[PDB]
Amino acid sequence: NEIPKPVAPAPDILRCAYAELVVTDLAKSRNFYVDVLGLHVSYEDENQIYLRSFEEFIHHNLVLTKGPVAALKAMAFRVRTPEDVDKAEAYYQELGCRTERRKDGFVKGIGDALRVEDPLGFPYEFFFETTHVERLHMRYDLYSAGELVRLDHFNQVTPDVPRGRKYLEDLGFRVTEDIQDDEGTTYAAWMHRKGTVHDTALTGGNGPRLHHVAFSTHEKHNIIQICDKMGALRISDRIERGPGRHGVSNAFYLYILDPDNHRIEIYTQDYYTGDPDNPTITWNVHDNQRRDWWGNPVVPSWYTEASKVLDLDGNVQEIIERTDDSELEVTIGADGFSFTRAGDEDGSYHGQASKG
Amino acid sequence: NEIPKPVAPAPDILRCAYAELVVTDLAKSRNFYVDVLGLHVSYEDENQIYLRSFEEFIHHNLVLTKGPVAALKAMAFRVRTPEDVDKAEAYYQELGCRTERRKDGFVKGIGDALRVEDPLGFPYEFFFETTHVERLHMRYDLYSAGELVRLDHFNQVTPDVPRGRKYLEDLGFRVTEDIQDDEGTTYAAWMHRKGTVHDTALTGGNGPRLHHVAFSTHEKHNIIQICDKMGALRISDRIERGPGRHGVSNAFYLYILDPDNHRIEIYTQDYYTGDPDNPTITWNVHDNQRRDWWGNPVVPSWYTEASKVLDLDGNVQEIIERTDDSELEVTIGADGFSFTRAGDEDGSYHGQASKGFKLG
Amino acid sequence: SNEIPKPVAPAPDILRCAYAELVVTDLAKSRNFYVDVLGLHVSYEDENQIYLRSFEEFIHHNLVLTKGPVAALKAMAFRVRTPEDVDKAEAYYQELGCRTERRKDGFVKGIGDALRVEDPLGFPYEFFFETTHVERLHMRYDLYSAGELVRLDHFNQVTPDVPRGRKYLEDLGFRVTEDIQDDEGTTYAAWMHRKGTVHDTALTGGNGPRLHHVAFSTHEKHNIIQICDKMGALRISDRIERGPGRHGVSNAFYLYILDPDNHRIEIYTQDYYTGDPDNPTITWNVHDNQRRDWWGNPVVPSWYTEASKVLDLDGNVQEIIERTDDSELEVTIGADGFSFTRAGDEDGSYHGQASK
Amino acid sequence: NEIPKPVAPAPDILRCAYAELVVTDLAKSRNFYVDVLGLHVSYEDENQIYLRSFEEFIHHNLVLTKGPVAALKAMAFRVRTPEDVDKAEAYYQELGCRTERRKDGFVKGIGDALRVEDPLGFPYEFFFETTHVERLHMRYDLYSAGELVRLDHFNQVTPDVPRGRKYLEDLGFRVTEDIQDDEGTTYAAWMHRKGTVHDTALTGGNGPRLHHVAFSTHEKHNIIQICDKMGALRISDRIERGPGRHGVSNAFYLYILDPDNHRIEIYTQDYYTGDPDNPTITWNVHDNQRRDWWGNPVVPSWYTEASKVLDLDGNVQEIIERTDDSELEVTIGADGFSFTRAGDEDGSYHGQASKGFKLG
Ligand SMILES: O=C(O)Cc1ccc(O)c(O)c1
Ligand SMILES: [Ca+2]
Ligand SMILES: [Cl-]
Ligand SMILES: [Cl-]
Ligand SMILES: [Cl-]
Ligand SMILES: [Fe+2]
Ligand SMILES: [Fe+2]
Ligand SMILES: [Fe+2]
Ligand SMILES: [Fe+2]
């Protein structure tokens, strides 16, 4: 049922800022994120690793926290002013959501912060205050052939996309692209605060689950190098999907799996969305160029697998089942369909994925 | 001489949107911007060419207007709402500036628009309404090896950088980087509204003049290809400076000259500046990696040459001489100095440019 | 045995692969693919043929498209070092008992004295020295496409008995650089060279003679990406067969696409130097899931089963001989096949299924 | 003083294979070649460092030998068979050159080898036997953003280019490109054995001196990264020239200087030359696109500075002065000139370099 628009003003959200991920083996996770992927350590101890991308000046973009059950603990957005943390708290209380505020932060390098169990069951954090660190954007002495340069977005699995979309729109996120069919079903939506295609996105599925966290590279060859490195390390089985060109977003991309199966996307070269009348793009779910522009098939695991999320007590959120049609089933399942050219039988696929 | 902060609220500016350049030979200019550089035509007739970048959805990023004297006619910024055009009007009127309002626009594909003679003598346009066109961002069947994908920024030559900087800060532009010395002189500042290093910038010098308009590419090889193509067309004399890596902005770059000597920068891969406490970077004017990170010398024309700007009547604005120290003189001139490593004489340059060159 | 005995006559000194003549059924449709989509440069054309070359070529052409009733390879041509090498080629193939045809004025425009042969594997080979030089476009950056094809790199031939063909090609002066074998002693594929790259031709085990593909190179990996992107924009992504990827064998970045008659074209870049005579030969195990695609992406079955007909010297289709040796498709992705990411490790292995 | 063609057959040369450079401080040289540039160690001790590129399978491409005077000690070419070492010995003996044969090599990982003081005063080595090592071409776990993938070529400074060219042609090198003027002077020539633009090249100047050793990258961005890294390390003063696109060779390039001022070129994407009638390309010396296609000026040090070379006793070879015209002088000197378009004054430079600089 619809989530009401509060009377209270929404906080001014700048961008996605960091994710806190619970991991089971801190050493194995460090090897993946630091040794394989080259993220930069801002702080570490025996319980947590704080990591940042090459161009970041805030304390971190990723916190790995040792715990018993691998899951998303918080997806954090930075707000414009300290007063926006107050606005966030008032807004979510009006929404009837559980909130927790700590003046000294939940993780190192973040000050006054509000965590909330949002209407879709996700742990959101809003903060302004953060400890500045050395911005490594010109440290070409450190630069990796696969260098991850920015945190770009999150992607959330939720059972009712329109319900979630309206809520995020009220919160100030503008939809840039979406996937629908001719029967009124929405399968996915992308929405932004900062001037890129998205800061978060909704993928229709059983939820709440975290689909992925995405980092940017400068160039397409940097993504290719990550694949090449993973072949050399003989861990190509942890490449899930890609590399490719997205239809939706137009970005070059790759999806890989961390030691706890948390999915990480590598992403580059989407477009500017900062104008308020930025044209919304709607794709048909049966268009075989919507996810991979080259028509490469989307592996079923990409649709079915995603990370658990925690509530404010650190317990796993119960999963609610999607009743709307499944993107997997309608495109690549036994009764699925996709096309290369709308209305052309040639280059269409019935009851199977593209390319054989 | 300080420009006061108006009581009237500043318009909410989104980004640089387009420039209108007066050109003397429309066909020669079209050859440069369309045939050489690959910009996309939104409209053209005997008097004007309207051009846009690969990823743009507003009507245009560049208007070429035939006229007797080559000059910048307007640098245009898009504002967030129609109401912001009224705000801009009230703001500049409070500053004591001349303003002109046209409900149906000054150029095709722009609606209600305000043009102003700003306090630094520059013709700024503010608008919201614009005719949307086909966004070509996935038209890879059109994509050039040198494709210009966005309009990124303007750069303005002005004699008193602190005076201009304060005015633009009150307008909502935050300074991301600057160049100063230890004697209190500011030589240049970069300032933004959209989340990149800048939408405009001030370069110290006699002004008002337009230093350049900058377009972005996706990747560094795209900029390399523009150079390569200019060599194949045997117009390498129109490559002024570059390609290089900037210190300030960290962008890969190239400067080229159009048929009327309007300078165009091609630019890629600067960083995100959208957070309100984005760290402001100050480089010393004597640091030889500040403009070109690799230490390549900055050709003197880059410091001395820039385009005329017009007032609202279309007449050239009179030039006011800079009295602050000259970046050229203090770095590559007779009594100039630059260093590679602060405090190291090794890799320093005295009275000449880096890499074995002197001023011609 | 059915070995191809080494002639006493000296082998012609072969420089490199030089051009292919492909018979096509609709010349205008083929022109649109090779010129408009792929950007090859016209060296001559009329109502029956189109002659095309790559960006860095100075000989007359790398590809001749000839209108005919049945799409097929008509000749795969190698340039020899001197005019006398055409004589050597004729004596060599005559000793092998092969049908030969010598045209002192060439078979196609821009080639002079030329010998065509029905080789012992049933392939139409041409050997020539004389060719009309044309403008080398290597610095014509005013013409350069975002997907520019810069050189002709190699051919790949489907033949039933790889060792038989390999020894024949070795006698002809081709050195094997890489191959794929199993522990039981079966050879599935071999790559072999004259010029200093991984190959000028290659043998893929299968029913033959059939032409598997013709390969062109690009300068950089982004040029191959652009070809894919362009094909998506033209809504012909169904003509992208496999890739883009990193090869295991050759280490080259690659893509396979299909022309209007289903002739397969590979785009290829950045293999390694093989010109030293003791260049180390690399043998991969057939069950290694990084041998073909280094990133472990699956090889679609059509890549193993589909290939172009070849013609005899009368222009008739050559009869096909079925492979009796084990099938690479069957032993890797068929019902009883398997592959591994790490030898000996069931984690990352695939059984009776392809990867991913 | 022409060098006659021997009756004895030339050795069959495959390619350039390695250079032995004498360096004065082994640790500082190691920092440059291993830490800055990322070359791979095949062997090292207190006296020498043996280095190879990413795709090499022979033992090394570069030997750094500690010694009192920095210099080229040997430029080594691999020959096709063991018997070609005997052919090289007979060939150079017929030429009247000093030869030294060591059945177990001069440096580690090379077997039977011949070193000669060649007719141009250069120390050449010919060998077949070399210890194979792990070919790192797919070791993407090691791959750096600036990875050097192959040894491509040498470049030699010699006073009489036609005299040297003839000698190298008799040895089997074929000329691919050269630079001449209308009055019949030759300034430079490029020549090959393997199917690239060159394995060695001759630059007119006082000699024998070693101009540079060149390594390849996969892509242009790899060269850009080397520049970026040198800026981050605050050693941009060791970037001599570039990055650029060459006219001659069409390769993307960069020139940097090691701790002893030995010049290293980074290079990529030249073209195939393996056909025996490969078209030769001759450029006019006044063509400002011949060296840098984009017309960027050639720094005077590029023309004047080069490394000493040693004789077989390890003593520095005496230098012979060039008497033919100087490329520096005829192009960028006070009486030089260059053009963008032949015959066009627009885009031409007289008495100075392109882009607005004169000689420092
Ligand atoms: O199938 C693969 O991926 C192996 C491979 C390597 C080199 C090639 O040129 C080719 O066509 C196939
Ligand atoms: Ca001072
Ligand atoms: Cl997707
Ligand atoms: Cl600059
Ligand atoms: Cl040069
Ligand atoms: Fe994503
Ligand atoms: Fe700029
Ligand atoms: Fe191939
Ligand atoms: Fe060189």
UniProtKB/TrEMBL annotation, chains B, D:
According to the record, the residues making up region (Disordered) are 343-360
Query: Which residues does the record give as Ca(2+) binding sites?
Result: D182, E183
Give binding positions for Fe(3+).
Answer: H153, H212, E265
| Lipid metabolism keyword on record | no
The record's PROSITE patterns line, in alphabetical order, gives: VOC
**Pfam family membership, one:** Glyoxalase
Q: Does the keyword Oxidoreductase apply?
A: yes
The record's annotation in InterPro entries points to: DHPA_dOase_Mn/Fe, Glyas_Bleomycin-R_OHBP_Dase, Glyas_Fos-R_dOase_dom, GlyoxalaseI/FosfomycinResist, HPCD_C_sf, VOC_core
Q: Which GO terms describe its molecular function?
A: dioxygenase activity; metal ion binding
Q: Where does Fe(2+) bind?
A: H153, H212, E265
Coiled-coil boundaries: none
Keywords in alphabetical order, please: Calcium, Dioxygenase, Metal-binding, Oxidoreductase
Binding locations of Mn(2+): H153, H212, E265
Q: Name all VOC domain ranges.
A: 15-129, 150-269
Q: Which PANTHER family match?
A: GLYOXALASE FAMILY PROTEIN
The protein depicted here goes by the name: Homoprotocatechuate 2,3-dioxygenase
Q: Give the organism's phylogenetic lineage.
A: Bacteria, Bacillati, Actinomycetota, Actinomycetes, Micrococcales
